[PDB]
Structure 1
């Protein structure tokens, strides 16, 4: 699953960036994704983490937006594309999320 980019704690590791557990509720709200639908489309939700800085907030919502743009959602009803789904599922294939959204 797609993971957020977080700053490790302590002064020994605060200069690096690693992968987090899940996106915060504020990040999902800014990206326009409901918490009940994020799990369905494979976006982890972390209720404990909070966005204390705009930089972290914008970084994570940018990751969600890139994930959403590159995401293909199969319609639940075949041949009946609903809202937010796609009708170009012919070319869908399994691809690594790390290549699309590396931790930079």
Structure 2
């Protein structure tokens, strides 16, 4: 919450880094079910 952005390609990279991430994860519903998802130990490794 304490850094501002001044480059478009840096903003584009970070915005693209969130759109791709949200499409590659599943959020387990609060209700129930949600079977095991074979967790991956590292998140930064999957996104170089």
Q: TM-score range by the shorter chain?
A: 0.7 to 0.9
Q: TM-score, normalised by structure 1?
A: 0.40
Superposed CA RMSD in Å reads 1.6
Post-superposition offset of 1:90: 3.0
Q: SS at 1:58's partner residue?
A: helix
Q: TM-score, normalised by structure 2?
A: 0.76
Q: Segments of 4+ in structure 1 off by > 6 A? A: none
Long gaps (5+) in structure 1: 1-46, 80-88
Q: Tell me: higher relative CO, structure 1 or 2? Use CA pairs within 8 A at least 6 residues apart.
A: 1
Task: Give the alignment partner of residue 10 of structure 2, picking from 20, 37, 56.
Answer: 56
Aligned length: 47
